[model samples]
Target: MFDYSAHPELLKGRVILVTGAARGIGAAAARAYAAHGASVVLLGRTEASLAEVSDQIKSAGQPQPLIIALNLENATAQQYRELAARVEHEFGRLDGLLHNASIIGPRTPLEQLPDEDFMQVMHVNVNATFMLTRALLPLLKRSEDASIAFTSSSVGRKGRANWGAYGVSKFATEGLMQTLADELEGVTAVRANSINPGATRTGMRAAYNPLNNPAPEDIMPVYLYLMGPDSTGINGQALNAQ
Candidate 1:
């Protein structure tokens, strides 16, 4: 268990971005970051859903969130650069970026998993993340203390049967985090880490044992910790949000 608790102004004056910010763990994380005084950018596929999240933050008297509707599944490199440009224009610098979007593609044996499904999963979960991170790195470097947190799963750290493409992509995500962390070490203030949000009650886990799982709200302390100043010394680590 990654025990953590955030102060009310933990993320004060910072600008953070949350991908897949429409719902599930992404939505929960966006709300949490806002409540802690961060100016959040909600990036997701649906404008309506992103607006709802923005409304929630507004109603709570937190900083108004910026909504960017871009589907990671088909997001292009140029789109990512544009996103970086928009954020840089609005906030001057990016303090945190939470890569929380993912898809569960074909929960079947590896031999039975369709080739296209595997590619799609990898594209969204790994390639898109890479491109977005690359685009945002300069903006992040401008911050005094920046954090880039990647989402991971249990199967990512250790492979399991019947998990297929989703599982493999998570492993790649972990690898990406490590590589980025190493590259940025000592050269910049930016830090990179990955977190496994274990079995939260999100739409992605609806078909599983949802009744017994914790809500996304229950697991945000870890999210806040990694993004805030407390974890400045912690880099290149894989954490569990439980």
Candidate 2:
């Protein structure tokens, strides 16, 4: 097991951003980062949920997090620019970015899938991530060392019959991570990687496999490792957080 308690200050003084912060692994990550002394910014569509997460962090006596309530799937390039500006003005630099937001589109054969469904999945998983990361590169580069982790899936690395658009997006995610990692190698003190949080107990998992029994909390150690400075030298790797 990856032991986080051994180094309680691994993320201290870091400013991190996590998308889909309302619930599931995203929320869990926010709590973990805050516990480790990071100032986390919770980005999600639900205002109430973001407020709740921020309140929880504040109650724990960690630095109060900035909550940005904007849906990635629907956000415009200008909105992303504004968000990047806000983060820069408020935090000066961003130490990490966790692209945890995703949507599991309908499970069907490729031929049977609708064009709109495929587009929706790409909008959330691929397009939004690309734009957000592009907009935040300047802020991230300001940090002495920065890490960017994207969520991937088992089906993403291998083609599955009914995984549909979700799988396709994940494959693209891996490419994005690898390409960015290569592009930033040496020139920038930034690392990019993708993690497959396989079979975690979440709404998306339940939809795909109603019988799987893995707990969501059981899968957080990998997230903690990837986002913290411990993995500073690791880049372009597709890791399994199971």
Candidate 3:
């Protein structure tokens, strides 16, 4: 875990966009960035939750974050274009993009999992990421040093029993990150990587294992690390945050 207290000014003057910013990891990351003086853009499906996060940042003495209530699972290329335009119009350029929103579909054997449920997971975890990143590449390229971080899982690197479509989608995410990182090497300062947040106390973790004790806050060190400049040279790697 990286220590933000050691380098509080690392993210100053930066602009970040975090997906699934309504709650859980997304909300936590948003708060962390704001504390470090980064202007954040909150994107999530819930308007009330987005507004709450926006208000929290404002109350904390940070600039009021821009909030976009969007459902990634159903969003189109045009919607992604509009989002990019909005971010550019508001913040001028993007310094970081954290793909933290995800869905864990039914935990069942591959054969027992319904195709619809599996597809839903893919839509949220893979397709939406692809579409959004593709649309935002132009804005990201404009930054002096940009970072694109995707949320990964333990099962994403290694397939596991009962992990279902979520794991498979993460595998795709890892591939996507690696391929992009390789393609952009030395060509652009933009970095791409994946972070596997393991065993945090959240609704998603509780649904998989009802006995874990790690608080969501305890998992934020790694989140803060990857989002800041200390890890600027780190790309195409799958990191664990716990």
Candidate 4:
């Protein structure tokens, strides 16, 4: 087993943002970030679900969280700017951003997939990520040490037969991470990387297999490591959290 239990209040006094915070790995990550003493901003389309995670963190006596109800699939550039302004005004600077929100399109062959479905996957996974990250770059640059973590998949690195747009988006994700990592390495302190959380026990995982596997909480040590100061100089790598 990968021994990553030796952790600490490493994220104390930091502010982090996590998308798709309503459920699955995103919800688990929000709780983990808060537990480690970071103030997390939970972003998702469902207000009720965001509130659930927010209350969970508040009840735990961790830093009070900020919940923003927004759908990446249709969120506009103006909304993204407004969000960045809020984060800047409230937190002053961002310490970490985890792009955890993603949708798995129809599990069918590429030719059989609908055009709308494919684009929706791209809009959520690729376009929104680009817009949100671009809008927040100035705020992220404010921090002396900042990290942007993109969520990747096994299919992202190696294209599968029917993974479709979700797989393609992840490949774009890897490219985005590398591009940002290289651009920010010497010019700024912000670092970028992607994590492939293979076969986690998520709703999206059920479509592929039913084998009992690692839960979102089981893989969080890696999340904590990358977002915290310990992994500061590392960049442009696609790491596995298993």
Candidate 5:
């Protein structure tokens, strides 16, 4: 495990966008990034909690953070486009985008997985992620350097029984990250990678157990490394964050 906190001033002058920034590992990353000198734009379904995360960042230091209270499950491509436009108008550029938003439906065997559950989980976990990333790629390319971090699970890196749509979506995430990295290599300064934040404390872990899991903040060194300039040129790989 990474034994230190964020490298001081590690992300200074970088503008990072983090989805699911209201809680869990997403919130942790938002806070850590700010402390390390990156300006973070918070996105999540809950405005109140999003506000809370923003406040946490402000008091902990940094001016106000930008927030997009959006539900990825039903968000439109047009809405994502609006978001990109807004970021361009406001923050003016994006250096890092961490795809930490995801959903988990009922756990069932492949044959037993309900169609609605599968589609809902897959849509948020896969489709919306792609749409949002696609919409923001231009703004990302505006940066002299950029990084896209996808949140992956253990099941994503390897097959596991009974993980259903959630697992499949993560597998899709892994593939997406790699494909993005390949297309961007040497074509632009942007890099892409996936991090498996194994069993971090969060509601998503209740399906098994959250008690023994590492706190979300504990995973930052790895998360910070990828988002910062230190990891430039390191692309196209799945990484562990805990």
Candidate 6:
């Protein structure tokens, strides 16, 4: 389990973008980032939910955050490019990007999993992530130090039955993170890593046995460590949130 107590000013003046910022781990991360002095951009499908999170951040007197409501499943490359441009215009550069948005498709055997379902999960968890990262690469490079974090799962590293599309997508997520890390090593200040957040008490986790699972807030230290300057030299590693 990754552990660290972030200094209150750890992310002072930094701009971080987090997808799925409306709820679950993403929401927790957005608030935490803002509390630590980062100006966060909340990207999610629902404007109201994003606004709720934004309100909380504002109420706490953190740097004001920006909200961009986008559904990754159908998001186009042009939209991602526009998003990057918007961030560039607003913040000059992106210091961190937390790719926390993802959908868990039906937990069925591979033989019964529909292709449409698989594709939908892939589009949101894998394809859209690629397009968004590609579009944002320039903005990330402009920052003195940048970190890209991906959300991965246990099933992603080791094959497990009934996880189907969701598991496969997470595997792809880790692979993408590693590929980017290798390509950027010693070339730029950009670093990439993936985290397996385990079974947390979120809306998504409600379908599982809910007892004893940690809340999203409990797993956020790893998120803080990865997005801030404290982990500057760490790259291409798969992390776990306990």
Off by over 4 Å in 5: 3-5, 209-211
Off by over 4 Å in 1: none
Worst 10 residues of 1 by lDDT: 202-211
lDDT of 5 by residue, 97-194 (tens): 99999987777798999899999999999999999999999999989989999999988878788888988999999999989999999999999999
Compared with the true structure, the alpha-carbon lDDT of candidate 3 equals 0.85
Query: Model 1, 57-90: lDDT tens per residue?
Result: 8999976788888988888999999999999889
Which model scores highest in lDDT? 1
- Residues 1-242 of candidate 3: C-alpha lDDT, one tens digit per residue: 43445266678878999998888878888988898778898998877879887888889898778888788878988999999999999988999999999999999999999999999999999999999899889999998888999999889988999998988999999999999999878889898988888777677777455455566666777777776777777888888875
TM-score of each: 0.97, 0.94, 0.94, 0.96, 0.96, 0.97
Tell me how far candidate 1 lies from the true structure as C-alpha RMSD in angstroms.
1.1
lDDT of 3 at 6: 26
Candidate 4 residue pairs in backbone clash: none
Query: Could you tally the backbone clashes for each prediction?
Result: 0, 0, 0, 0, 0, 0
> How are the candidates ranked when ordered by lDDT, highest leading?
1, 6, 5, 4, 2, 3
Better of 4 and 6 by lDDT: 6
Tell me which of candidates 2 and 3 scores higher on lDDT: 2
Local lDDT at 159 for model 2? 83
CA lDDT of every candidate: 0.91, 0.86, 0.85, 0.88, 0.89, 0.90
- Please give the lDDT score for candidate 1: 0.91
Candidate 2: deviation at residue 118, Å?
0.8
Q: Could you tell me how far off, in angstroms, the CA of residue 100 lies in candidate 6 after the best superposition?
A: 0.5
Clashing pairs in 5: none
RMSD per candidate (Å) reads 1.1, 1.7, 1.7, 1.3, 1.3, 1.1
Scored by Cα lDDT, where does model 2 land?
0.86
